[PDB]
Coordinates of C-alpha atoms in Angstrom, one line a residue:
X1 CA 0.0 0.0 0.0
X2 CA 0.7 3.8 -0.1
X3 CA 2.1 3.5 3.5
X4 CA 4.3 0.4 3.0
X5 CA 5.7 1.6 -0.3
X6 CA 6.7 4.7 1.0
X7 CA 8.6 3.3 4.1
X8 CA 10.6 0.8 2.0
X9 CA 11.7 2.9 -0.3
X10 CA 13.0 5.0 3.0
X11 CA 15.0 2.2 4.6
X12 CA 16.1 0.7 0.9
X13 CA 17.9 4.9 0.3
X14 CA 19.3 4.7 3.9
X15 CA 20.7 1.1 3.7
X16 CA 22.5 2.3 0.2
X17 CA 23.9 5.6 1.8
X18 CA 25.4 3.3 5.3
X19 CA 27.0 1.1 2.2
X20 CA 28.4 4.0 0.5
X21 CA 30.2 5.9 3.2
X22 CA 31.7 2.4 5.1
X23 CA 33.2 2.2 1.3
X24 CA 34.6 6.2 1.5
X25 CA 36.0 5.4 5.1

């Protein structure tokens, strides 16, 4: 739904940026 979507999307954009600057450090 319009509530899940939304949510998963969130936590799927944060788990990619964590990934990103443990890579950078």
């Amino acid at each position: 739904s319009s509530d899940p979507l939304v949510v998963a999307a969130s936590i799927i954009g944060i788990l990619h940026l964590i990934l990103w600057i443990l890579d950078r450090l």
